[PDB]
Amino acid sequence: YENQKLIANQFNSAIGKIQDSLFSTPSALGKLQDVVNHNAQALNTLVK
Amino acid sequence: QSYTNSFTRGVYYPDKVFRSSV
Amino acid sequence: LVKNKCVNFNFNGLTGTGVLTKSNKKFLPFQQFGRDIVDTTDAVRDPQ
Amino acid sequence: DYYVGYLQPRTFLLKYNENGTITDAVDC
């Protein structure tokens, strides 16, 4: 109740930093891409 | 009578199969 | 030669089943077949 | 005014262009 404004500003800055971090770094979403690539590799080996 | 080195020459088409961007 | 019909073909010894349509691919004037990353016949040139 | 070389059994990686033309093969 005393530092409401400061906490709100901190949260607002943090969410923007998270958005920028996700936008910039391309290796953040490694796991999902790895799953997709593994499935594609399995199918390609099977057909080959 | 002399000797040289083949930089990148000697590549030919192995077969008669068309391939696109592979 | 028929087109747009599921018809068996025997192009110059290459045999299979499929639908034969018009192709926009450019062939060098020595290549007969056509493959892809999966290594299956995708396009063939008319022996005639 | 000419060169002679002998062929050996190797393994090669070839890059085909969209118009299927071999460019920049690499040895193995």
Ligand SMILES: *[C@@H]1O[C@H](CO)[C@@H](O)[C@H](O)[C@H]1NC(C)=O
């Ligand atoms: C490939 O073929 C197209 C269509 O003829 C042509 O415009 C292009 O210059 C050719 N070469 C390359 C490297 O794209």
